[PDB]
Design a protein around this ligand. Structure first.
Ligand SMILES: CC(C)C(=O)Nc1cccc(C#N)c1
Length: 460
């Protein structure tokens, strides 16, 4: 049985509004309703992995697992294996996989982050799962962020707290947060960003929704505007939204948006909004294609509609050669030329680089670079030709060209990372000097750039 080079992943996010689900929710897992929907001809075809995020979930883990497993069984005639389930308050993530994948899945991690302090430490935060699927690392984050049209800053703060403190993936990757630890990272949930238009425009917004004219609404979506100003979800992707706002509905119909301020809303308006979202961030030059992104029309127990997204995602095999794993393959090397980091830091201290990759027996520390002043005030850290020669465990190009090198630039004085980034080895050529580039972030904020040239030696 050959190892896959591609899998399909279903991502679901549903804020259940503290109500049990209806007897049939199969439309969700089939990507049927509004938006970018899945072809009817695929309905019997199971996804390889199903990742379900709920918010305001009133069910026990046992109650929800029974509904999810029985649902997928009715659709596919396959009995899914439970990879992981983690719940923080009423925020839950379930990962299910086809039985044929049981022995391809390992290194399963779960974690949660509680957001807010005293007042605001109450019910918001994130849960997450990570695991290895053969040679591919996969991360999944379900977050319920701060509610309310006037709290987009709080939501952006909740995001930064979750990405700093959610402990998933390989703990040996100590300089890197979740936004660098995974081949493919999926981040979804009730992110609670709103359509930022005047209250008096509520009926105009509803009219626009009824005509399926989303352009003037999405131009005021707080997640799109905050992302365009690099305030949140830097370097993440989202498929185009072509479905109606998923919040806030009257329960038991989809014919009506409930937007007016009530005691129950803290006297806040809930203008129709895309609260419920799926974003992803994959390593450079890895295959990832969104094949669906939409909302169900027929599940009406909550004041939110479930959202689905499906993805084709590139995966690699667990490679074994005569040499690595367990030693280096002297037929392989990675060299770096004319390299320099440009940093936004106003500080003047020495820096060195760390290289981390599963293609190396362990991480590699460089010599300190030489600091120079950029023409526009920047700190430029010059490595020139001084960066070490990296020694991969496997030289076969079918392995090495599918790998990535994570880079951290660290203070000599503190050993603290000032910026992290990622370089693909999927080069246009081997044994050839080629430009490389990565932005550098710290706590998911842009802190600089790394550029230079690479020269990759493989066994071919
Ligand atoms: C007890 C549960 C959470 C568990 O360990 N699940 C698991 C582990 C390894 C592979 C797969 C699959 N498929 C599932």
């Amino acid at each position: 049985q050959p190892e896959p080079d591609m899998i399909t992943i279903f991502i679901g996010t549903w804020n259940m509004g503290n109500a049990p689900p209806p007897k049939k929710i199969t439309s969700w897992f089939l990507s049927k309703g509004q938006g970018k929907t899945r072809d009817d001809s695929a309905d019997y075809i199971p996804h390889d992995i199903y990742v379900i995020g709920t918010q305001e979930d009133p069910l026990s883990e046992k109650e929800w697992l029974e509904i999810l497993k029985h649902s997928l069984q009715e659709i596919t005639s396959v009995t899914f294996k439970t990879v992981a389930i983690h719940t923080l308050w009423n925020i839950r993530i379930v990962v299910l996989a086809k039985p044929e994948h049981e022995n391809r899945i390992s290194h399963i991690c779960t974690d949660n982050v509680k957001t807010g302090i005293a007042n605001t430490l109450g019910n918001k935060g994130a849960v997450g799962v990570s695991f290895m699927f053969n040679g591919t690392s996969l991360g999944f984050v379900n977050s319920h962020l701060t509610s309310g049209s006037e709290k987009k800053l709080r939501r952006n703060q909740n995001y930064m707290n979750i990405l700093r403190f959610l402990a998933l993936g390989d703990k040996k990757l100590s300089p890197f947060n979740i936004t660098h630890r995974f081949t493919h990272l999926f981040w979804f949930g009730d992110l609670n960003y709103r359509v930022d238009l005047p209250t008096w425009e509520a009926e105009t917004i509803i009219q626009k929704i009824k005509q399926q004219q989303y352009a003037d609404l999405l131009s005021h979506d707080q997640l799109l505007t905050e992302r365009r100003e690099q305030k949140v979800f830097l370097h993440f992707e989202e498929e185009e939204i072509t479905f109606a706002p998923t919040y806030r509905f009257e329960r038991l119909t989809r014919d009506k948006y409930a937007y007016t301020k009530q005691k129950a809303t803290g006297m806040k308006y809930n203008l129709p909004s895309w609260c419920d979202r799926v974003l992803w961030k994959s390593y450079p030059l890895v295959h990832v294609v969104c094949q669906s992104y939409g909302s169900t029309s027929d599940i009406m127990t909550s004041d939110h509609s479930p959202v689905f997204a499906t993805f084709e995602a590139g995966v690699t095999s667990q490679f074994v050669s005569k040499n690595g794993p367990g030693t280096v393959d002297s037929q392989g090397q990675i060299e770096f030329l004319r390299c320099y980091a440009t940093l936004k830091t106003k500080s003047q201290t020495k820096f060195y680089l760390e290289f981390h990759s599963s293609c190396l027996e362990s991480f590699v520390k460089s010599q300190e670079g030489e600091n120079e002043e950029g023409s526009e005030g920047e700190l430029v850290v010059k490595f020139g030709e001084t960066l070490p020669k990296l020694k991969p465990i496997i030289s076969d190009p079918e392995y090495l060209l599918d790998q990535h090198i994570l880079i951290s630039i660290k203070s000599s004085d503190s050993d603290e990372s000032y910026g992290e980034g990622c370089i693909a080895l999927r080069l246009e050529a081997t044994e050839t000097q080629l430009p490389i580039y990565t932005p550098l972030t710290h706590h998911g904020e842009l802190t600089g750039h790394f550029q230079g040239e690479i020269k990759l030696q493989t066994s071919q």
